[PDB]
Amino acid sequence: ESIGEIMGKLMQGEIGDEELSKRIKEIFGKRLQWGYKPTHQQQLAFNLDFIKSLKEMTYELPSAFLEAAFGKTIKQSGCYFKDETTTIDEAEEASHELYCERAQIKDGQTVLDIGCGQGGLVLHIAQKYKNCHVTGLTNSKAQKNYILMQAEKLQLSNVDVILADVTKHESDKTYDRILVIETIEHMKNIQLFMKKLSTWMTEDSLLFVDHICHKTFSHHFEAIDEDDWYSGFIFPKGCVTILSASALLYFQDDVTILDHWVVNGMHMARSVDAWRKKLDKNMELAREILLPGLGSKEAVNGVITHIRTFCMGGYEQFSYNNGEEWMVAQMLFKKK
Amino acid sequence: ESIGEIMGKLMQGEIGDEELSKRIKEIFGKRLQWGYKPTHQQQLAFNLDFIKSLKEMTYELPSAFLEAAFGKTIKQSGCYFKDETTTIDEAEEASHELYCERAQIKDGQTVLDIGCGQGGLVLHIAQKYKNCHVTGLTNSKAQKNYILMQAEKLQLSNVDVILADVTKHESDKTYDRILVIETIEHMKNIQLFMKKLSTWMTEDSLLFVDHICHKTFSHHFEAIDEDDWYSGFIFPKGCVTILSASALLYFQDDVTILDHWVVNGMHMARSVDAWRKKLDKNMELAREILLPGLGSKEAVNGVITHIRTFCMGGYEQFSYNNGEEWMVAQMLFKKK
Ligand SMILES: C[S@@+](CC[C@H](N)C(=O)[O-])C[C@H]1O[C@@H](n2cnc3c(N)ncnc32)[C@H](O)[C@@H]1O
Ligand SMILES: C[S@@+](CC[C@H](N)C(=O)[O-])C[C@H]1O[C@@H](n2cnc3c(N)ncnc32)[C@H](O)[C@@H]1O
Ligand SMILES: COc1ccc(C[C@H]2c3cc(O)c(OC)cc3CCN2C)cc1O
Ligand SMILES: COc1ccc(C[C@H]2c3cc(O)c(OC)cc3CCN2C)cc1O
């Protein structure tokens, strides 16, 4: 059975959830076999090769659809679930709190959020710390517009948004706190990225980075073999890197580490599960929202299949071995 | 059975090798239980606590005895064994070569070897690279005297030795290459140590560090519980730290990492095994050498028991799980 066959049945909804989960789990199993080496000597050789390799390197979903699929603040990153009964809305808030603690946010600081998405964290900080000035940076005009609208509705006067590709953005402005939440995965050139960030810091600044990781090894999000239909379906563009939990320790040319944590993968698994369940509940509504801007019911079904499969696959990835394979890494840095 | 009882029988040579090895292996087993955490979240918490804690912090054996126990150049660090039949002399040379490769030694460079011991590496570099100037730094007058004598005998004109406590040594001199071979384990204040080293480097310099490690966690070389008679016998002074293989990644305030390796622990195990076997072979000779400077046969037996037990214990430590627990870590750095 080829890619085309599985992809065919997937699109027609002919693959049940049990079989889909089983197939994706097997794909991730093969990645683990690829990544784990027999000795620490070999493991480090493998990891350092990856790190050395790094040092050499328009359609948007309507907001109404996003609101039907994601939690209240449309957080598009791993959330934090205290209980089995924690709702996605509660888990978003808990994550926001966690970032504020770990990044040592204090009232009165200037804060920059890089790749701020729909601006949940920006809005959280602005509301909690009235004397902070909070800037979001996004490459999406739609996202900028959404954040500014929300700030107006929430009577916030301390929010601004920079519309820019961060890799091209030039400014002399510095910030007390820089946050990068699950954005570094998309960065083509990390050494340059960290260098740029350092130029936006003073001696008093802190930088907080959160990224999806594997505990042991790094990998690009791409197919190992021909049997992997999943990786290329989800990200048809080789633009996602999954760093090991310790990978950023090797990128301290321009910044110095102060603290380092990981969050168990079950939190991410619970996040994607919540999105999948919410999308399922609002399926009829979702199809109606998407139809105008997509043109055909066939195109709508395609977009929905893609998002739903992402969630099903994410569940298998992050829940693997009770969250002890793929997880989230967090680091705090100061400037050199 | 108390410490005193086991220590009593040990001194009398009433504990056979099989029982001694078994007892020491069990002590190391308990360290592994102490060090390994159930989740990566907990593991990182444990490791970061250790790293944070660090950031807050006359009798010498005759040379004739050392020559009877150690290899030709009296290397007192892990050696590298290609074959099962590799001799300690061959393994010393192989290690020296390995350091020269990894530290990127080139003819004409100024080289500083910190805690140079009996100067095997200093002499190796001086002989192989005639245009290099090589400086050893040691806190031992006896060691300085030995190195200078050997340099004279080998017709080397490119060797000097600094007699200093490295933690107190002040100089404006800089070096193209700084080597630290199994000396950092003895350093009370590592952050300060690395800072000092950086002041002895230029933008063109490289720093190479080699240290005994555990792959996963850090620990002081000391007793966990009352059942551990071994740790305090070997090092009656809490002056030895076993860093994790990645611990130095968190000490990049003043230097930046370029490469990182580990060497499997079986090499160290083979090293201590070779020393133990050589001491055993030259036992009668060793006792005769030690007698003058120690005063009594009882004092001689004590010193020999201590060294022999160190080797027996080292074997159990480094061979644990086929060398995949305790091993040797190596790192290459440049200056900020
Ligand atoms: C996975 S989302 C995480 C969003 C947000 N931090 C959150 O936690 O919900 C990463 C974001 O980075 C943005 N992004 C990617 N590449 C970018 C670039 N070069 N410049 C600016 N933003 C970028 C994407 O548009 C996306 O919204
Ligand atoms: C374990 S030996 C390794 C010796 C040598 N590098 C080798 O590979 O054989 C570490 C050496 O560091 C020396 N040392 C320890 N503390 C020192 C200090 N504060 N200043 C200078 N040397 C020191 C010890 O005397 C010892 O010879
Ligand atoms: C469709 O839009 C998205 C919505 C939510 C996410 C969550 C998360 C994430 C989750 C995954 O499981 C994954 O696969 C390894 C990749 C990524 C990329 C980084 N990102 C923060 C990513 C998106 O692209
Ligand atoms: C008696 O003099 C010594 C001779 C040889 C060594 C080898 C090695 C080493 C080997 C071990 O197995 C060990 O225990 C964990 C500690 C150490 C300290 C660092 N050092 C480089 C150390 C000595 O102190």
GROMACS .gro file of N, CA and C in nm, chain B residues 66-134:
model
  207
  402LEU      N    1   5.562   0.570   4.188
  402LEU     CA    2   5.469   0.605   4.082
  402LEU      C    3   5.504   0.529   3.955
  403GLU      N    4   5.635   0.517   3.927
  403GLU     CA    5   5.685   0.449   3.808
  403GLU      C    6   5.653   0.300   3.814
  404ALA      N    7   5.641   0.245   3.936
  404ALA     CA    8   5.616   0.103   3.955
  404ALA      C    9   5.467   0.071   3.942
  405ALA      N   10   5.382   0.174   3.953
  405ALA     CA   11   5.237   0.154   3.958
  405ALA      C   12   5.170   0.200   3.828
  406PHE      N   13   5.215   0.313   3.774
  406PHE     CA   14   5.153   0.373   3.656
  406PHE      C   15   5.233   0.338   3.531
  407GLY      N   16   5.183   0.384   3.416
  407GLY     CA   17   5.250   0.364   3.288
  407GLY      C   18   5.375   0.452   3.276
  408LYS      N   19   5.440   0.443   3.160
  408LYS     CA   20   5.572   0.500   3.136
  408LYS      C   21   5.576   0.650   3.167
  409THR      N   22   5.472   0.725   3.128
  409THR     CA   23   5.476   0.869   3.148
  409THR      C   24   5.402   0.908   3.276
  410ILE      N   25   5.363   0.807   3.356
  410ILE     CA   26   5.295   0.825   3.483
  410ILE      C   27   5.169   0.910   3.464
  411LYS      N   28   5.092   0.877   3.360
  411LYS     CA   29   4.964   0.942   3.337
  411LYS      C   30   4.866   0.901   3.447
  412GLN      N   31   4.803   1.001   3.509
  412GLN     CA   32   4.713   0.979   3.621
  412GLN      C   33   4.574   1.027   3.582
  413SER      N   34   4.530   0.981   3.465
  413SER     CA   35   4.401   1.011   3.407
  413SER      C   36   4.363   0.895   3.316
  414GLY      N   37   4.237   0.892   3.271
  414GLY     CA   38   4.191   0.784   3.186
  414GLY      C   39   4.271   0.778   3.057
  415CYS      N   40   4.304   0.655   3.015
  415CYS     CA   41   4.378   0.631   2.892
  415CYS      C   42   4.284   0.570   2.788
  416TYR      N   43   4.334   0.549   2.666
  416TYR     CA   44   4.249   0.504   2.557
  416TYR      C   45   4.303   0.374   2.499
  417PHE      N   46   4.220   0.268   2.506
  417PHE     CA   47   4.262   0.133   2.470
  417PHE      C   48   4.190   0.089   2.343
  418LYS      N   49   4.266   0.080   2.233
  418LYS     CA   50   4.210   0.036   2.106
  418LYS      C   51   4.173  -0.112   2.114
  419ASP      N   52   4.265  -0.194   2.166
  419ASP     CA   53   4.252  -0.339   2.167
  419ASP      C   54   4.247  -0.390   2.311
  420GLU      N   55   4.212  -0.519   2.325
  420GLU     CA   56   4.213  -0.585   2.455
  420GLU      C   57   4.358  -0.608   2.498
  421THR      N   58   4.450  -0.607   2.401
  421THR     CA   59   4.590  -0.635   2.427
  421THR      C   60   4.672  -0.506   2.436
  422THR      N   61   4.607  -0.390   2.422
  422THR     CA   62   4.676  -0.262   2.432
  422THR      C   63   4.738  -0.252   2.571
  423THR      N   64   4.867  -0.217   2.576
  423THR     CA   65   4.937  -0.198   2.703
  423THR      C   66   4.906  -0.058   2.755
  424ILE      N   67   4.930  -0.037   2.885
  424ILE     CA   68   4.908   0.094   2.945
  424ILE      C   69   4.997   0.198   2.878
  425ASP      N   70   5.120   0.161   2.841
  425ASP     CA   71   5.211   0.254   2.775
  425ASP      C   72   5.152   0.299   2.641
  426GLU      N   73   5.096   0.204   2.566
  426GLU     CA   74   5.033   0.232   2.438
  426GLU      C   75   4.908   0.318   2.457
  427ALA      N   76   4.834   0.290   2.564
  427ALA     CA   77   4.708   0.358   2.590
  427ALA      C   78   4.732   0.503   2.632
  428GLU      N   79   4.841   0.529   2.705
  428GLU     CA   80   4.881   0.665   2.739
  428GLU      C   81   4.905   0.745   2.612
  429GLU      N   82   4.982   0.688   2.519
  429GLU     CA   83   5.019   0.756   2.397
  429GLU      C   84   4.895   0.787   2.313
  430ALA      N   85   4.803   0.689   2.306
  430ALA     CA   86   4.680   0.703   2.230
  430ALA      C   87   4.594   0.818   2.285
  431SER      N   88   4.588   0.829   2.418
  431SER     CA   89   4.513   0.937   2.482
  431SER      C   90   4.575   1.072   2.447
  432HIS      N   91   4.708   1.080   2.462
  432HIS     CA   92   4.780   1.203   2.430
  432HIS      C   93   4.748   1.248   2.287
  433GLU      N   94   4.751   1.152   2.194
  433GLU     CA   95   4.721   1.180   2.054
  433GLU      C   96   4.579   1.235   2.042
  434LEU      N   97   4.484   1.168   2.109
  434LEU     CA   98   4.343   1.205   2.104
  434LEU      C   99   4.324   1.349   2.150
  435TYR      N  100   4.391   1.387   2.259
  435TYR     CA  101   4.381   1.523   2.310
  435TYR      C  102   4.436   1.621   2.207
  436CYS      N  103   4.548   1.586   2.142
  436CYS     CA  104   4.609   1.676   2.045
  436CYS      C  105   4.516   1.699   1.926
  437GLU      N  106   4.449   1.593   1.880
  437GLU     CA  107   4.355   1.604   1.770
  437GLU      C  108   4.241   1.697   1.812
  438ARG      N  109   4.175   1.662   1.923
  438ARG     CA  110   4.051   1.728   1.962
  438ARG      C  111   4.073   1.874   2.003
  439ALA      N  112   4.191   1.904   2.060
  439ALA     CA  113   4.226   2.039   2.100
  439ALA      C  114   4.286   2.118   1.983
  440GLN      N  115   4.299   2.053   1.867
  440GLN     CA  116   4.345   2.116   1.744
  440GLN      C  117   4.483   2.179   1.764
  441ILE      N  118   4.575   2.102   1.823
  441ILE     CA  119   4.712   2.146   1.843
  441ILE      C  120   4.782   2.152   1.707
  442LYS      N  121   4.851   2.263   1.684
  442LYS     CA  122   4.928   2.285   1.563
  442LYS      C  123   5.066   2.337   1.601
  443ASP      N  124   5.167   2.300   1.521
  443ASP     CA  125   5.303   2.342   1.548
  443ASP      C  126   5.309   2.494   1.551
  444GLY      N  127   5.382   2.549   1.650
  444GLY     CA  128   5.403   2.692   1.660
  444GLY      C  129   5.316   2.760   1.767
  445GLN      N  130   5.219   2.687   1.823
  445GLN     CA  131   5.128   2.746   1.920
  445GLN      C  132   5.192   2.751   2.058
  446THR      N  133   5.147   2.847   2.140
  446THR     CA  134   5.173   2.846   2.284
  446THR      C  135   5.064   2.762   2.350
  447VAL      N  136   5.106   2.670   2.438
  447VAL     CA  137   5.016   2.571   2.497
  447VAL      C  138   5.034   2.576   2.649
  448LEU      N  139   4.922   2.581   2.723
  448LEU     CA  140   4.923   2.574   2.868
  448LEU      C  141   4.846   2.449   2.911
  449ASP      N  142   4.909   2.366   2.995
  449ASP     CA  143   4.844   2.248   3.050
  449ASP      C  144   4.822   2.266   3.200
  450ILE      N  145   4.695   2.278   3.240
  450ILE     CA  146   4.660   2.313   3.377
  450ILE      C  147   4.641   2.187   3.461
  451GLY      N  148   4.718   2.178   3.570
  451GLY     CA  149   4.720   2.058   3.652
  451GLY      C  150   4.785   1.944   3.575
  452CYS      N  151   4.911   1.966   3.535
  452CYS     CA  152   4.979   1.884   3.436
  452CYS      C  153   5.029   1.752   3.494
  453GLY      N  154   5.020   1.736   3.627
  453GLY     CA  155   5.063   1.613   3.691
  453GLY      C  156   5.212   1.587   3.666
  454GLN      N  157   5.244   1.465   3.621
  454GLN     CA  158   5.382   1.426   3.597
  454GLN      C  159   5.425   1.465   3.455
  455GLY      N  160   5.336   1.532   3.381
  455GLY     CA  161   5.373   1.607   3.262
  455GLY      C  162   5.377   1.524   3.133
  456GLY      N  163   5.310   1.408   3.131
  456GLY     CA  164   5.308   1.323   3.013
  456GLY      C  165   5.261   1.398   2.888
  457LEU      N  166   5.155   1.478   2.902
  457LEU     CA  167   5.097   1.547   2.788
  457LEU      C  168   5.188   1.662   2.746
  458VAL      N  169   5.244   1.734   2.844
  458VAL     CA  170   5.336   1.844   2.818
  458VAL      C  171   5.454   1.792   2.736
  459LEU      N  172   5.511   1.679   2.779
  459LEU     CA  173   5.628   1.621   2.714
  459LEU      C  174   5.591   1.569   2.574
  460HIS      N  175   5.470   1.513   2.560
  460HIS     CA  176   5.423   1.462   2.432
  460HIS      C  177   5.414   1.574   2.330
  461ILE      N  178   5.349   1.685   2.368
  461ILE     CA  179   5.330   1.797   2.277
  461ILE      C  180   5.465   1.859   2.242
  462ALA      N  181   5.553   1.873   2.342
  462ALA     CA  182   5.681   1.938   2.321
  462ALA      C  183   5.765   1.859   2.220
  463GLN      N  184   5.757   1.725   2.226
  463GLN     CA  185   5.837   1.638   2.141
  463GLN      C  186   5.779   1.634   1.999
  464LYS      N  187   5.646   1.633   1.988
  464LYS     CA  188   5.580   1.618   1.859
  464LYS      C  189   5.580   1.750   1.781
  465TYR      N  190   5.573   1.863   1.852
  465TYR     CA  191   5.561   1.994   1.789
  465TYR      C  192   5.674   2.083   1.840
  466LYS      N  193   5.787   2.081   1.769
  466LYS     CA  194   5.910   2.142   1.817
  466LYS      C  195   5.899   2.295   1.823
  467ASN      N  196   5.808   2.352   1.743
  467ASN     CA  197   5.792   2.497   1.738
  467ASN      C  198   5.687   2.545   1.838
  468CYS      N  199   5.617   2.452   1.904
  468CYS     CA  200   5.528   2.490   2.013
  468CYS      C  201   5.611   2.525   2.136
  469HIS      N  202   5.566   2.626   2.211
  469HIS     CA  203   5.614   2.641   2.347
  469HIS      C  204   5.505   2.588   2.440
  470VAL      N  205   5.545   2.498   2.529
  470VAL     CA  206   5.452   2.426   2.615
  470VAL      C  207   5.482   2.460   2.761
   0.00000   0.00000   0.00000
